[PDB]
From a paper:
In the human pathogen Staphylococcus aureus, c-di-AMP is produced by the di-adenylate cyclase enzyme DacA, which is thought to form a complex and be regulated by YbbR and GlmM, two other conserved proteins. GlmM codes for the essential phosphoglucosamine mutase enzyme, required for the conversion of glucosamine-6-phosphate to the early peptidoglycan synthesis precursor glucosamine-1-phosphate. We determined the atomic structures of the S. aureus DacA and GlmM enzymes and show that GlmM readily binds to DacA in vitro and blocks its activity by masking its active site. Specifically, our data suggest that GlmM blocks access to the active site of DacA and in this manner prevents the formation of catalytically active head-to-head DacA oligomers.
To gain further insight into the function and catalytic mechanism of the S. aureus c-di-AMP cyclase DacA, the soluble catalytic domain starting from amino acid F101 (hereafter referred to as DacACD) was expressed and purified as N-terminal His-tag fusion protein. The S. aureus DacACD protein displayed the expected globular fold, with a central β-sheet made up of 7 antiparallel strands flanked by 5 helices (left). While the L. monocytogenes CdaACD protein was found to be a tetramer in the asymmetric unit (although dimeric in solution), the S. aureus DacACD was present as a symmetric dimer, with two protomers interacting via the backbone of α3, β2 and the loop connecting α3 and β3. At the interface, residue N166 from one protomer formed a hydrogen bond interaction with residue T172 from the second protomer and a van der Waals interaction was formed between residue P173 and residues N166 and I165 of the neighbouring protomer. Further analysis using the PdbePISA program revealed a total buried surface area of 1450 Å2 at the dimer interface with a ΔG (int) of -8.3 kcal/mol and a ΔG (diss) of 2.1 kcal/mol, indicative of a strong protein/protein interaction. In order to condense two ATP molecules to c-di-AMP, two protomers need to be arranged in a head-to-head conformation. However, in the S. aureus DacACD dimer found in the crystallographic asymmetric unit, the active sites of the protomers are outward facing and hence are too far apart for c-di-AMP synthesis. In addition, analysis of the crystal lattice did not reveal any symmetry-related molecule arranged with the catalytic sites in a head-to-head orientation. Here, we show that the S. aureus DacACD protein is a dimer. However, based on the data presented in this study, we suggest that this dimer is not the active unit per se, as the protomers are not found in a head-to-head conformation.
Residue numbers in the entry:
A (entry chain B): 111 to 261
B (entry chain A): 110 to 202, 204 to 260
The structure:
Amino acid sequence: SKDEEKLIQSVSKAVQYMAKRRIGALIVFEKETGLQDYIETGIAMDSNISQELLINVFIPNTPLHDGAMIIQGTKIAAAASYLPLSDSPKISKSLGTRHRAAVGISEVSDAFTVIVSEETGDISVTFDGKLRRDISNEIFEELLAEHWFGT
Amino acid sequence: YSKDEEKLIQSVSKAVQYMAKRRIGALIVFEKETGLQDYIETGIAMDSNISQELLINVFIPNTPLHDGAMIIQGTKIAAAASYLPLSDSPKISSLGTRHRAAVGISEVSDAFTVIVSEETGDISVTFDGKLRRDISNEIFEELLAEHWFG
């Protein structure tokens, strides 16, 4: 749908902007597994999605930057949520807490999560327990549409 | 006021105090009877719940959302980075852009607006064409409760 396409672009442009600036980001998209428990660890927003708000949330040294944004349908449910951290040895001891968090939530839920690395600006995603690293902008948009909306 | 109303008041007050200390300019408009939809539509739509954290995040300098007014409708943030009209009054023009904007919206609406000065951290409010400068935290909370929740 047209409105779904608008939302994919909003998220994609935000993720691309943060990747360019090497702004760390962690955004979880709820699917079938209810994430209310993790949402309640963060700051409740129930906010509409925009490129501008997504970027604002993750600006370094701001109250909402640390932790995960969790999106439920067309709304931002919360920011600065605490995800569990994976103990997988596959996660290079080099990789930061955000990656461990993204894999962590993917181990205990069917959520689709995007991570922007603050070191490299690489875009990665997790789902079904596995980190998929350093994907292109075009592939991120394709996977996001698939997992978020099923389009 | 209800406990929930009380919590909202505290959320806004704490955010304003935080920004004041750090000399972060802020401009928050509380809609009353005059509909502000036209101004809301110039901003970035949010329809978000209110927290101290989100209010601070919005006004961080050099972010997309800091450049304009936050407009609140009931218990929700309708929009950020909204345009407000600048006051036409010569006598009022003498102060800066944010304050002239706060006076301006109060001249064409019954809205209640709070401004934090970037220069001094002073808290000021506007209502009914009137500007009240450098008010205490306690007076701010009293006035906000009256205007926001009746």
